[PDB]
Amino acid sequence: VLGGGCALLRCIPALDSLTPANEDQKIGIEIIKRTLKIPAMTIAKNAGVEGSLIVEKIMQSSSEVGYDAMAGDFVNMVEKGIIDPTKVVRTALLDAAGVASLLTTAEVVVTEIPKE
């Protein structure tokens, strides 16, 4: 799939066709929708530029256009060879979402008093 975090960016419209059952499901869908922009924003931020503007310009462009952080310009990722294994992307997303969702369901935390 496209590299640079654009694979997850192109999946944002797929979340607008969902119908949440209740308000909490809508909250969760919005959480995932906001999260989908994080990899591209982080890659742009590490390059010394503003991640928000880069992500906005990526989303306003055509489906084959993304951002080359190394060169620092908007290019065709398949043509330039910035591609990612789809297995890696889906595995990372699934694991991150699964663990963090369960973490965010906590109300009480029990730890051990630091004897040593």
Ligand X SMILES: Nc1ncnc2c1ncn2[C@@H]1O[C@H](COP(=O)(O)OP(=O)(O)O)[C@@H](O)[C@H]1O
Closer residue to a copy of itself in complex, CB, 55/89: 55
Question: Is 95 annotated as ligand-binding?
Answer: no
Among 8, 43, 54, 55, binds ligand X (CB under 6 A): 43
Of 28, 62, 60, 56, which Cα lies nearest the Cα of 41? 56
DSSP label at 108? -
What's the token pair of residue 67?
């951002």
Q: Which of residues 44-73 bind ligand X (CB under 6 A)?
A: 68-70
Is residue 50 at the binding interface for a copy of itself, with CB under 8 A as the rule? yes
Q: Assess 30 for contact with a copy of itself (CB under 8 A).
A: no
User: Burial code of 27-54, b = ≥16 C-beta within 10 A, e = fewer?
Assistant: eeeeebbeebbebbbebbeeeeeebeeb
What, of a copy of itself, ligand X, none, does residue 69 touch, CB below 5 to 8 Å by kind? ligand X
Binding site for a copy of itself (CB under 8 A): 50, 52-53, 56
